[PDB]
Design a protein around this ligand. Structure first.
Ligand SMILES: O=C(NO)[C@H](O)[C@H](O)COP(=O)(O)O
Ligand SMILES: O=C(NO)[C@H](O)[C@H](O)COP(=O)(O)O
Lengths: 157, 157
């Protein structure tokens, strides 16, 4: 039930990251802070998001959350990591479907896009919704993993 | 962004055809990467990898991948070298994808919005210019350097 979660964030998602770490500790989960460890208005998101995604993939069973202003540059950075699948969660439904259909180990959230209560509801759905293991979803994940292996674009039907 | 490459599976197929018609009416040249017909069991990765590959290989072009939530679609597009695919779920996030992230592509969930809401997201995506600001370009360069070497950049602190 209790999940390990690696969190990464730049200045725009820093304040929300600290609140999410506090929320995860209080709900039986194990947050691990990859940075940023303090507010720095000029810092760059890529390093924090690549660190969180890299450690998530290297620690199977763990999840991850990357935070920014919109969360989009953050999920893009995380998605460059081999083996990583980072959805952008902007609601309870998309957080749940990230796990259910895409088996996403990570999610990006925009700190400027939600209130604190809305963001924590997104996090709750992400860390409790199980991976469905449905055949068609695993088939799509296998195709994408094969493209990641060789970078040879598969033929279209 | 004049030429716009669109990829989609069955869950985003009907919305993709509506976006192609809307783009023709607003002076753009949409190019259909597939699926060309509705197939309830087809897999998204191939259509999204094809749209992202062709967009990155075509200077000045943009791209849109569609699915149920558009999250597995942006994930697949982000595995393509050089590609930056945001998940656009609003006018604000579509505009910020261009302005901050220089995203050549966006994912959209056909099940998450009405037709009118989705077309407004598309309008913001194709009309909002890339800012070319120093800090945004710097972050895109750090990400592109990680794609080339797979050397995770050091975390500040
Ligand atoms: O939203 C983001 N990336 O998607 C970044 O956090 C955002 O561009 C940072 O912008 P800022 O440097 O104006 O705070
Ligand atoms: O939403 C999606 N990817 O994010 C896919 O289109 C979705 O998982 C496809 O599901 P379906 O095969 O039930 O239509």
């Amino acid at each position: 039930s209790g999940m390990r979660v690696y969190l990464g964030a730049d200045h725009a998602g820093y304040e929300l990251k600290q609140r999410i770490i506090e929320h995860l500790k209080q709900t039986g989960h194990e947050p691990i802070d990859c940075g940023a460890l303090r507010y720095d208005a000029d810092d760059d998101y890529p390093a924090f998001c690549i660190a969180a995604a890299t450690r998530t993939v290297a620690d199977p069973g763990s999840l991850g959350i990357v935070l920014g202003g919109s969360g989009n540059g953050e999920q893009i950075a995380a998605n460059k990591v081999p083996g990583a699948r980072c959805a952008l969660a902007w609601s309870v439904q998309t957080a749940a479907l990230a796990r259910e259909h895409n088996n996403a180990q990570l999610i990006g959230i925009g700190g400027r896009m939600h209130t604190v209560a809305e963001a924590l509801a997104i996090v709750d759905a992400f860390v409790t919704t199980p991976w469905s293991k449905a055949q068609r979803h695993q088939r799509r994940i296998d195709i994408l993993a094969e493209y990641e292996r060789t970078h040879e674009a598969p033929p279209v039907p």
